[PDB]
Amino acid sequence: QPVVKSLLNSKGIHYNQGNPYNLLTPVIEKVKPGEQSFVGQHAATGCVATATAQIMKYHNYPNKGLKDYTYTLSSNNPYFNHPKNLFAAISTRQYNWNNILPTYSGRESNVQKMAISELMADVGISVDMDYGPSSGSAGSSRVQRALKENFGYNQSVHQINRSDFSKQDWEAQIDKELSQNQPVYYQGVGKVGGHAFVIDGADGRNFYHVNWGWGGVSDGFFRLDALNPSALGGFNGYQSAVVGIKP
Numbered sequence: 001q002p003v004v005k006s007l008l009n010s011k012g013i014h015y016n017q018g019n020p021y022n023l024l025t026p027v028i029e030k031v032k033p034g035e036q037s038f039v040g041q042h043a044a045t046g047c048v049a050t051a052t053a054q055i056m057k058y059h060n061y062p063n064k065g066l067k068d069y070t071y072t073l074s075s076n077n078p079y080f081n082h083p084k085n086l087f088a089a090i091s092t093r094q095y096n097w098n099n100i101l102p103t104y105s106g107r108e109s110n111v112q113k114m115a116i117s118e119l120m121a122d123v124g125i126s127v128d129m130d131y132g133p134s135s136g137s138a139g140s141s142r143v144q145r146a147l148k149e150n151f152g153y154n155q156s157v158h159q160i161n162r163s164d165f166s167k168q169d170w171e172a173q174i175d176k177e178l179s180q181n182q183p184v185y186y187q188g189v190g191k192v193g194g195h196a197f198v199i200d201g202a203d204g205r206n207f208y209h210v211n212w213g214w215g216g217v218s219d220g221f222f223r224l225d226a227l228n229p230s231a232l233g234g235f236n237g238y239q240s241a242v243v244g245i246k247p
């Protein structure tokens with residue numbers, strides 16, 4: 001195993017799901033029965049969209065979108081009135097990656113805040129995001145499609161499932177991407193549900209650096225079968241990844 005210092009940290013890339021990243025997500029319309037109300041608030045960007053956007057910022061690509069996308073919200077969603085359709089005019093987008101900053105603390109211009117909110121909403125719509133105070137997505141299977149068809153990433157983009165490999169071969173896939181200066185999309189499921197994040201480093205002793213997409217919270221080094229962030233209370237089952245992410 002090679003040693004690779006965290007690729008996202010080297011570029012100051014630290015995104016989150018709340019403000020100002022979610023200023024263009026759908027505004028919540030209903031109160032989930034018996035729950036405290038989130039009406040009038042923008043939905044979370046979703047960890048699937050945050051992890052993908054962090055990878056896209058690392059490559060600063062694309063300058064122009066390739067294809068629009070539309071989908072209909074799941075009728076199960078208790079936060080919006082149905083039927084609810086969402087649309088992103090990605091094919092007309094001129095992404096200004098000099099306005100899409102590596103991280104936001106609130107001191108930024110509104111041109112810069114709207115630039116990252118544009119990307120976060122475009123990416124989220126591209127992966128059929130189930131919006132809410134927390135926002136969910138199928139993850140890897142839609143990330144690989146969206147990066148290729150909507151944003152024109154390389155044909156090398158594809159999803160790999162943990163159940164298809166030995167432990168050695170699975171880690172070898174991750175190690176190859178990192179040594180190519182290519183961060184890796186990753187996701188897993190725990191008792192509380194699933195989460196999507198980014199692998200961008202390796203300690204050379206089977207610990208991997210993780211960017212959970214929570215603005216830096218619990219970021220550090222973890223083993224692939226012990227992805228237990230302290231912010232939870234792990235995402236070690238049904239693990240999948242998207243590799244070969246490059247222009």
Ligand SMILES: N#C[C@H](Cc1cccc(N=[S@@](=O)(F)N2CCC(C(N)=O)CC2)c1)NC(=O)OCc1ccccc1
Pocket residue numbers: 046047048134135136137138139140187188189192193194195196238
């Ligand atoms: N931010 C953010 C969201 C947080 C969130 C929001 C709502 C529900 C939820 N829990 S889920 O119950 F829906 N869960 C259990 C069953 C699993 C399965 N059987 O595939 C799917 C995942 C998690 N994260 C995310 O969307 O997880 C992507 C992901 C997708 C597949 C696998 C791993 C991760």
